[model samples]
Target chain A: GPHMEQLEGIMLSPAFQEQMNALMLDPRMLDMMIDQNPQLRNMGPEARQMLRPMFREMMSNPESMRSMMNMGRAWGSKKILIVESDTALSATLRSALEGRGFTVDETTDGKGSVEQIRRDRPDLVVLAVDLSAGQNGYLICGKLKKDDDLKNVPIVIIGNPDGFAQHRKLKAHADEYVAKPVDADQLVERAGALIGFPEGNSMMIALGVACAIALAIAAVYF
Target chain B: GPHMEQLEGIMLSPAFQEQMNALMLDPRMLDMMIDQNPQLRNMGPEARQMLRPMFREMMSNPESMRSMMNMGRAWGSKKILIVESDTALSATLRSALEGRGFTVDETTDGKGSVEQIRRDRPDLVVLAVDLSAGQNGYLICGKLKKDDDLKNVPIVIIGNPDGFAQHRKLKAHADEYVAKPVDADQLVERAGALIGFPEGNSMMIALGVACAIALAIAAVYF
Candidate 1:
C-alpha cells in the first residue's frame, strides 16, 4: 500500500501542494522545480518571475512542456488525459506528462473535458473520482463508457482503498481502478498494459506464422 | 552502432528476419516473461502449457496478454511499427508491443497508412522508407505535421542512413528520423520519450520545518 505512493501520488497530494506552494511561490515549489529541471530554476529572476505569472495564467513553457512530454512518452504512449480538481495538481501532472512526451490534456472538471475527449480519444484516462458539485466520477465513468462508441476506450479510475473497494462493486463497468496517492509510474505501467493491446495483430500473426511453418514442414517431409 | 541497430535497422536486414523467425516460435521469450512477472513462473506447467498456445495458436491467450499488458504498463515500452512490406516485422512488433505494453500496428504498403492516420493516429510512424515506396513516409511526415490539426504528432521516418542524414533538413517534417536496423528498446524509448516526461516523480520532499520558519520570519518582516 505504501509502495503505491509513486510519483503522481506525491506530486498531486494535498501534502505536495501545500509543500510546493510554500516552497515555490509561497515557499519552495519553485526551488524544487529549479533543482529537477535546472533550466526552469536557472531562468533569470525576471524569467523566474514569469513562473508565478505562469502559474497564475496556468500555462507552462514549451521546453518544460517538451521535457514533460518526453517523460510521459518514454513508455511509448500515444496520448493521456489527466482529470483532477486542483490547479496545482493539474500543473504538476501537466509537467510530468509533458516531460515524458505525452500530449496530455489536464482538466479539473468532467463536463469541460467532453470536447477534449472527442478530439484526443487518448489511449488512457488517469481519472480522479471525487464528489464534486452535482457530479461524481462514478457517474461520469458510467456515462462515458456506456456510450456504445466510447466503451472500447480504456479508463483507469482513481480513488482510495475504500473508494476502490466501492468501485469493485461496479468493477465490471470500469476497466481498471487504482487508489489515490499511488505513484504515477505504477499507474502508467498498469494502465499502459491494460490499454496497450490494439487487438487483431500479434496473436493473429503468431497463428499465421505457426501454420505457415507447419505447412512448410509438411511439404518438406512429403 | 548498437544505438543505430535498435532503430528498426537490424530487424530490417535480410539476415535479421531469419533470426526473428527462428526465435518467434520458441518459448524463450515466454521464459523471460516468467522471470519478469514472477508469479507466472510459479504456476503449474498446466498453466504454462496453456500459456504456450498463443505462441502456437491462431489466437493469443488472455493470460499471456495479461502478462504483456502488465509489463508494458509497469516498465519501459518500446514500440515498433513495421512498414507493410514485412508482415513478419508486424508480427514481431505486435508480439513485443503486447508484452511490453507498446502499441504496434501495421500497414501493407508505406502509402496505405494515410487512411489509418486519419482514423487511428499513432505516436510515431515506423515507415519503411526504402525501395520504390521509400519516400512515402517522408511525404506522409511532411503532410501530417503541415496539417495544423495533426501537427503535434511526432513521426520517426524509418529508412536507410544515406537519406536519413537529411532528417535534420526534414526535422520540421519528422520529429525523429531513425534508420532501419532499430533496437526495440532504444527506438521505443527515443520515440516514446519524444512525447513524455519520462523522469522520476520523486521530488525529495525533505524540506524541513526551516522552510516554515523562514515563512514565519518573512511574515513578521512583511
Candidate 2:
C-alpha cells in the first residue's frame, strides 16, 4: 500500500509530470522504457487485449488529459525548422539536431519560409543564403525580421566565406551566420547556445539530471 | 612506515605530480590548500623555519625538476591574450576567462599585438575592432592571417554590427567575430570553443573528473 502511495505521489508531482510529458516526445524514451521494462514487450496478445479497457480508462482520467496538454507545450517549445535547398545538408543538420531531442522540420527552398516560419512558429530556423528557384535567404530574413509577429524568431544563416562583400551589402539580419562547409557539430552547438541549451553539454547534462532523478526515485523506494 | 610509503608513492606518481603542478597555478588552490591543511598555518615561526630544509630538499630532487617542466607546459597551453582598448571591457573579459582557469594577458592597443602574439604565443586572442591611438584591429587581423607562423592561432574580433559594410571590405581573416556591446559570457564561450575546450562544460567537467578521482582515492584509503 505504501509503495502504491509513493508511486501515486511521484506520478502526480508537478516536476515528475512535466518530465514525463517531455520524455514522451524524446526519441530515446520508448526504447529505454522498453529495455527497462521487458515484461511490457513479453505480454501475450490476450493479455494486451485484456489491458485495453484499463488503458482506455486511464486515458479518460483528468491527469492524462492534463499530461496531453503539457506534452503539446513541451513538443512545441523544442521545434526547429530548416530552410535549406541542399537536401543532404538538411538531412545531416536534421539528424544532428534531432539527436539532441529537438523536433526538426525542413523545407527545400526559401520561397515560403516566412509563411512557414509564421505558421510553424519554430524556436529557431536554419536558413541557407543561396536558395533554389530564384529564392533569396536575405530577402526572407529581412521580411521575417521586419514582421511584428515573427521578429523575435532567431535565424542562423549558412553562407559562403568568400562572399563576404556580398554579405556586407545586406544588414546583419540573421541571429548567427555560419560559412559553407558547415560542421554539423558547430552549427548544432550554436543552435543550442542560441536557444539557451548551454552548448555541447546539453544532452550530457540532461542525462546526468535524469540519472540523478532515477537514483533519487530508487532511494525513495528501497 | 606503510603510511609514509603510501604518501611517498602518491607524491611521486606522474599523474599526481602533474595535478600538483596545475594546482600550483590555480588562483583558488592556495585558499583551498590552506583551508584543508590548517596545521600548516598554525605552525610556529621556528617550526616553519625548520621546515625550510625539508622543502629545499624536496625541491632539489630530480622528480621535482621534471614536475617544474610539466608545470610550464600546462601553464603555457591555457593562455589567452586580450587585444582590447576598452579597459572596462578588457577587465570583464579577463576575469571571466581567468575564472575558467585560463591565463589572460591584456594590451590596450593593436600596434604591438602581432609581436605580442608572437612572443606570448597565446592560444587565443580577443581583438576589439576599435583600438585607441589610431590602431586598426582589421590590420592586425590581416597581418596575423598573412603570417605563415601565426595564421593557425585563432582570433575572435569584436566589432559593431552596423558597420557591416566596413567588416565586409575586410576578408574573413578572424576565426570568429562578435558584434560590439559584446556579451562577455558569449565571448568567453567562443574563445574556449576556438581553443578546443568543450564549450561551457569544460570547467564543470573538469571538476566532475576531479571529484571522481577524489572519490576513488577515498575509497582506496578507507
Candidate 3:
C-alpha cells in the first residue's frame, strides 16, 4: 500500500502549497527543480506512493490550471482555423463552430495552411492528424508555433488514440486533445476558452461585421 | 528526450522479454522483483526514460493482455449484479447487460449489496458511487474484495470525482473506472471483454438463443 502518512505530511505543508502554486503558474520551475534533484523523477515506490496523491490531484484539475494560465472572457468575434482532410467532418465541424457565432475557416491540407494562416491569422487552430495533407499535423503545428507572427495562437489537437503516446510524440505545445467520436458541443466550448469571446470591447462589433461580410461573400464561410 | 538507445536495448533483450511474459502470467513476480531491487521502483529518469517505450507498448494492446488474463466464454448462467443509486442509471445499465445475453440483477445501494451479492454469487459487479441509500461505494467494494466468495468477481466502478479519490485512498482493487458522460457502447464492449465471447466452442447456438430467451422471458430476468 502507498505511504498515506507521508502523503498527509506533504499535503499538510504550507510551503508545499506555495511551491505547487508557483509550479502551476510557471511549469518551467518543475524542469529547473528536476535538474537540481534528478532523483525526484525516479524515486522508489515509497517515494512514488508518497507522490501519487499529488499526481492524482494535478490530473483531476487540469481545467482550472489551463483557465488560470489562459485568462480571458470569450466573445462571438474570435477566428478559428480548422484543418482536416475529411470533407464531411470538416463541414460538420465548421457548421458547429458557425452556430456558436465564431469566425471559422477550413483547410484540407497542411501546406496550404502555412500561407492561409499567415495571410489571415486565426486566434486558434483545430487540427486533425492522419490527413492526406502535405505536411503532418504536428509539423504544421510546430511550424506555426515557431513562427514569429503566430506563436501566440493556441492549438487544439484531435488525435485518434486511446492512450497518451501521440501526445508524447507530438510535443507540439497543443492546448488540448479531443478524443475521437468528437462531441461538437465540447469542441466548441474548448475553442471558446482558447479564443476568448469579446466583452464590452469596441473591436467586437467591427470584428463581427467584417466576419459577417467575409462569410457572406464566401460560399462555405459563416 | 527519453533514452531511446537504452529503450532499444531493453526491447531487444530476450531476458527482459521473457521476464515480462512471466510477470504477465503471474503479477506476484513484480512484488518479488521489487523486493529484490527497491531501486527498480525509483530509478533516475534515464531508467524511466528507458521504461517508457515498454509502458507505451503495454497500453497500446490492452485487449490482448486482458484477453490473456481473463480467458473464458460467458453465458446466461453468469449473473452480473449492478449497483447504482440512481434508479434510471441502474435500470438503463441493467437493460444494456440483459440485452447482451447476460443474467442481470439490480441494486440501489451498497449496504444491502453485501447480502444481495453473497446470496446471488454474481459473476461480476458493476458499481457507481454516491448514494442516498447507504454505505460508501468504496467501502462496500473493499469489503466484497476482501470477502472469500466475492474476491474473484471483476468489479467495474463508475465514480464521480470524490469517489475516485476514495478509490485512490482505499487502493480498492477495481478492474476499471469509467469516465463520466458514459458511452453505452464502450461500457458494454469492456464488459464483453471481461466476460468473454464464443470462440471455437460448440455451444454457440444454445448460448445465443438461451441468452436471448433468458433476456426476453423474465422481462430482464436471470
Candidate 4:
C-alpha cells in the first residue's frame, strides 16, 4: 500500500491538478513522445486484484523543474532508476522526470536493475513487467520488495492493460499500476507523490485524508 | 476546439484536484461497476474515430449525488445519451453517470445515434467506435461533428488501445479519446468539464487554463 503521507502539499496545487487533467486528454501525445524515444506492448487478463490508490500530481510547466530544483529541499538530488525493455518508453520516462529535477538511470533487464539497485539504491524505480532480459520485470519487483535493503524504495509498474487482471499473479508488488501507452506527465506525478517533494507538506497531509477514504474502501471490499 | 471559457471557475479547488487524481486511479473500478450491469460487446472502427474529451470534476464523496440534486444547478437535470453496441460498457457508463446525478438514454448503433441526437439531443453523448452495427463509430463522430444541430453536443469515443496509433486516420471529430477498458470515473469527469456545474466555479477556471496550455501545445504541433 502507498504511504499517502508523501504526497503532502504538491497534490493540492492547482497547477498540479491542471496538468493532470491536460495529460488525461493528451494521452495520445505519449505516442508522439514515444516516437521521439523508441520503447514500448500488448494485453492479457484484467488485474482488478491489484487495485491501487494513486495521487494525480504533475508539473504544470514542463520547464518547472528548474524552479523546483532551485528550491533545493523540494526537488533537487532526487534519483530514479528506470528498468524497461522498450527504449522509447524509457527515454520518455527519463525526460519527464529529468526535467522535473530528478536524476535518472536506465537499465534494459531485470538482473542489471537488481544488481544496480543493490549497489546504488535509487530513491525509486520505474519498471516494465515484460522486460525480456534476465529475470523479467515481475520477478524483479517481487524480489526487491522483499529485500530489506530495497523494500522501502518505491516501484511503479507499467504493463499490458489486458494483463492487469492477473496483477496479483505477477507477484509484482508495485505502488502504482500504469498501462501502455504511458502518459509521461502522469508518471512523473506518481513518482513525486511517492518520494515527497520539498514544497508538498500540506498536500501530503491532505493525502492522509484521501488515503483514509481509500483504506476504508479497501476494507469494504478486500 | 472546445471553448476554454466553459471551465472558467471549476478547476481550482485542491479538493477537486485531489479527486481528479483519485478518479484517474479509480478507472479500474469501472469494471466492477460494469459487472453489475447486464450489457455486453462487438464494436466497430467508425465508433473509434470520434474519440473524446471529458470532465475531470467529481464530488469527493461517491454518495454526494443527492447534494448535487439539492443544489440543482450544481449537478442535476443533465442528460447523457450513451451509444454503444457493447451493452456492458454502455450499461456501466449509463449507471456510472446515473449515480452521479445525470439522466441517461441508450442506443446501440451509430446511425440511430445521429438521429437520436438531432431529434432528442442529450447534453452529452458517450460513444463507442466499433459498433456491431452501422457504418462504424468514427464515421458517426465525423457525421455528428459536421451536423449543425448535433455538433455542439459533446462526444466521447471509446475504442481499442491497440488501434490508437491509427486514431489520426479515423477522421472522427471528438472532444476526448478514451481507450478501453473504460475508466468510468474519468468518463464522467470529462463530461462535467464540458458542461459547467453551478458550484464548480474554481475547477472550471483551472480547466480553462489547462485547456489554454493544451491548445498552445496543439498549435505548435498541428
Candidate 5:
C-alpha cells in the first residue's frame, strides 16, 4: 500500500512542504465533514494539512507562533475586492475570509470595479452580476481579462449557473466561478487556489492533479 | 507592482486548480465566495474562467499515457473509512472524496467503527462526534493515534473548538479539526495535507518548515 512514508524522502526535500501544502487544496474537492464534521465550514486556510498545524505555524508572522501553533489561524493574509450588488453574500464572505485573515474590498457596481482592478490589484477579486444594474458578471471578467494588463489576473465570479453560462459564452475570462448562496469553504478553496495558496483537501487535489495529468494524458493518447 | 500576469499564473497553476476544487466545498469558504463576488453564486465554474472548461477538457483521462507515466491516482483509489452519524455530510463527502478516486467506506455509529477501522485498515479514518449509537470521534482518534501501528497515519476530527481543545489537551491527537457545516474542498485540502501531498500557499508553508528547522537549530545552539 502507498503511504506518505513512500514519499517521505521527497517530502523532506526543498519546497516539498509548499508543494505538499499546495496539493492539499484541490479545486473539485468534497468535504467529508458534514454532520459531526462541519469544521470544514468554519475554518479557512489556503494550505491546510490534517497532519499538523504546520500551515499556521509556518504562515503566521513569528509572534503568534510562539503562543500556540494550534490556534487555527490562517497564513499570511490577503486583500480582496468585491464588485457586487449582493449585500448579504458580500458581508458574509467578507467576514469569513477576513476572519480567516483576508483583507476584503467591495465595490457594488462593475462600471467602477474595472478601475478598481486597475488601481487596487487586490490579491483576489469577486465580481458580481448585474453590473451597472444590467451588465453581467461575465462582462466584468471579460472587461478585466481583456485589458492587456488585467487579462491574466484571477477573477472569481459569483452568479447563477445560467448567468455563468453566459459568462462562459463571453469566454477567455474568469479565473474561477461560484454558485449563488455561496458556501464559505467552497469559495475559500477557489480563492486560495487562485492565490497559489493551498486550503483543505490539498493532498487530494494534489492527487487530483496527478490524477488529471495521468487521466488527461491517457485519455488523449488513447 | 504585482500585475495580473502573476495573479493569472497563480490561478492557472495545476496545483492551484486542485486546491480550488477542494476548498470550494468548504462551508466557511462559501462566505468568502459570495462576499468576494455574489454574482458568481448565479453562475457556476463556467462563469469563473473561460479557461476552466479547457482545464476540464485537458483534464480528460489519458489512457495512452499509462505506458510511460506512473499509474494510479494521487489518492491512489485507497479505501477510507469514515465514522460519522450525519448522512448528508457523509453522502457529500463520499461523493467528493470518491470523485478524487478514493474508495470510501463510512458508518454513522462511532461504536464498532474502530473494530471496522482495525479490520479494514483503510488508508485513513475521519472521526465524527458522538453518534446515535454512542461512540465518540475523539476516542477513536486517540485510540488510533496511540496505536503503534496506526500512530503515523492521519486522523482528522470534525467538531467545534471544544472538541478540538479536548484533542489538543491530549497533545494534538486529532490530525486536524474542521468547524461545523464542513467545507468540502477545505476538508479535502486538510486531508490531503495529512495524506501527504503538495498544497497551495505552499510557499509560506515552505517558509514555516524552514522556520521549524531554524527553531530547532536555534534551540540547540542556545
Candidate 6:
C-alpha cells in the first residue's frame, strides 16, 4: 500500500537523506558497519574507497533508500496471529516479528483461533501443531480452509519435524511448515515471503543492475 | 590466510564468471529473485531492464562474486566448539553453523571442554552456563581465560537471560554471551563477528560504491 510509498518518500527526502548521510558517513558508523560485516575489513584499499561515496548515495537513491525503510515497513500493514500454547516461544515469535514491524496478536490455544481469524482477517497465521488445549492446529487449519471467506489467508504451521506422520498430515493444510527449535529470523523471512511482503534486499538487486549497466557501458566504450 | 585469496581467484576466473552469468541471467532465476525480493516486483519496467544485466555483471565482479561464494566460505577454515549440554540445542547449533561451512565440534559438558579446546584449538567456543556434569561454564571460562595459550581464543557463553547476576558474572570471563532459546542465526553471526570472519554483505557494499561512481560520472557528463 501507500504506507511503503509514504515511508520511501520520507526516507528519500533531502532532510532525511542528509541525516542518513551524516550517520552513515560518520567514522564510528563505518567502524560499526565494518564490525558487523567483517569481510569488509579484509577488502582492498580500492574497495574501501569505492564504499565511502556509495554509502552517501545509497541513502539518497529512491530504490536503496526505499529498501532500507522497507525493512521496518515491509509488514507494516500485515497482521500475524500466532496460535502457540508455549508462552516463551510465543513471546519470542511476537518480539521478532514486532521488531520487524508486523502487527502481532496471540492466542494460547486453537479453540479461539478460528474465531480470532474470522474477526481479524489476519494477513497470515502461525499455528503450533500440538496445542495444549482446545483443538489441534490441523483442525483449525482445516476449518479456516473450509470457510470460503477465510480460505485464502496464508497459514504457517509450527511443529516437531521429527513427527513424520504428523508432518505428512500437516502438509495438506499448511501453506508453510516450520520445524521446532524455530529460527525466528527464518520464520520472519518465511512469513514475509508468504504474505507477499518479503523482507528487503532491493539494495542488492539495485546494485546488481547498476553494476551490470556500468560494465556494459565499459564494454561498449572502453 | 590466503584461503580467501585462493577462493577469490577461483571465483574471479573467466570460466566461473561465465557459468555464474548463465545461472543468474536465466528467466527463472530473475523470476525467483523477484519473488524472494518483492520490493522489486513494484519496480518500474525501466528498473526491471536495468536489473537484467546487473545480475550478470554481479556474478562476474570479484567483490560481489566473492561475497556470493563467501556465503558458504565466510566461516571456512574456522572451527566452532559448542559446549552446550542440551543435545537438541547442540545439534541445532551444529547444523546451523555447519550448514554455513564452519567446522563444528561439540561436547556434552564442561568436563572435557578445556581439554578439547586445548587439543583441537577451535577458532571459537560456545559454552552453556549450566552444565549437567563437571565444572560449570563460568569455571571453564575462567580456566581458559587464565591460561595464556588459550586466552587469545574467543569464548561465547550461553545462559538464561533471566539470570542477571550469573550473566554479569559471566561478562567478566566470556568475550561474548548468548541467552537461552538462542537464535541460531544470531549465534552464527556473533561467532563470525568474534572470529573476525563475519558473514558476507560485501555485495551490498560493492553495489553502493558502483552506484555512487555511476551517479558521479552521470553528474559530471550528463
- In terms of TM-score, which candidate is stronger, 2 or 5? 5
By TM-score rank, best first, the candidates go 5, 6, 2, 4, 3, 1
Local error of candidate 2 at A88, Å?
28
DockQ-based CAPRI category assigned to the predicted complex of candidate 5 = incorrect
RMSD of 6: 13.3
Against the hidden reference, what TM-scores do the models get?
Answer: 0.30, 0.32, 0.30, 0.32, 0.41, 0.39
> Model 4 off-target regions past 4 Å?
A1-80, A84-104, A107-123, A127-150, A156-222, B1-79, B83-89, B92-104, B107-123, B126-150, B156-222
Interface RMSD for all numbered candidates: 25.2, 22.2, 30.2, 19.1, 18.1, 10.3
For A105-197, candidate 1 gives per-residue lDDT tens digits of 777777755557767777667677773565566777877776776667677787656666666577346678887775665665564355332
Let me know the TM-score candidate 4 reaches against the reference structure.
Answer: 0.32
Query: All models, DockQ values?
Result: 0.02, 0.01, 0.02, 0.03, 0.05, 0.11
Best candidate, TM-score-wise?
5
Name the better of 1 and 4 by DockQ: 4
Candidate 6: tens digits of C-alpha lDDT, residues B143-171:
89988889878899888766545545653
What DockQ does candidate 4 score? Answer: 0.03
Determine which window of 10 residues in candidate 1 chain A has minimal summed lDDT: A197-206
Ranking by lDDT: 6, 2, 4, 5, 3, 1
Q: What lDDT tens digits, residue by residue, belong to model 2 across residues A1-222? A: 001222233224342333333433342433333224222234233423322232233323423222222222232235789999999999999998876557789999577888889887887899888899999777788888888898878898887866545654666477888999999988987986666332212222222222222222222222
Candidate 3 docking: what grade?
A: incorrect
Question: Which is superior by TM-score, 4 or 6?
Answer: 6
Per-candidate local distance difference test: 0.45, 0.54, 0.49, 0.51, 0.51, 0.59
Indicate the residue-level lDDT of B130 in model 5.
58
- The docking quality of candidate 5, as DockQ, is 0.05
Docking class of 6: incorrect
Candidate 3 scores a C-alpha RMSD against the true structure in Å of 24.2
Model 3 stretches with alpha carbons more than 4 Å out: A1-222, B1-77, B169-171, B197-222
Write candidate 3's Cα lDDT for B1-94 as tens digits.
1112222233243323443343334434323322232222332333223333433354344222222112213211346788888888878877
**Residue B76 of model 4: what lDDT?**
23
True contacts kept of each: 0.03, 0.01, 0.00, 0.00, 0.02, 0.18
At residue B29, give the lDDT of candidate 3: 33
